[PDB]
Amino acid sequence: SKVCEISGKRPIVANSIQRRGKAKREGGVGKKTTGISKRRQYPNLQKVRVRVAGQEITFRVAASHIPKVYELVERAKGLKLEGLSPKEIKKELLKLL
Template sequence: MAKVCEMCGKGPIVVNSVIRRGKARAAGGVGRKVTGISKTRQVPNLQKVTIRKEGASVRLRLCTKCMRAATAA
């Protein structure tokens, strides 16, 4: 499957990108106003890594968090 970590299953998520204008009340303004909300996708940082598994080389797509955990263990 595309854009999914093969070790932990982490995949893309959908988030709201909020656009604001104005000056904050704490800074002496009248407050921040929301002028637009659009959905965006955040995808994990996947890297192709070759790992030795049971004597054979296996090529996996891992997120960087899993890569760090795999090298530490």
């Protein structure tokens, strides 16, 4: 999925590592790797609809930065943002970042 609108958390290219065998730490002879495959770790993006400037706005933001959004919305109250449209509203809220 695309970037996080706040954190910019992108999908990363991780290497799924199918390991095997008992661990040396548990006396095992060693963690024999059976195979290594590329994959992608996707951010936990969500859609977040918010009524700002009498306008409902949706952010594809990571799960972590959800409350950061509401931080932004509350901060927008010291802004004169109406009657802008949701495009300009979203741009300006991005500017508050």
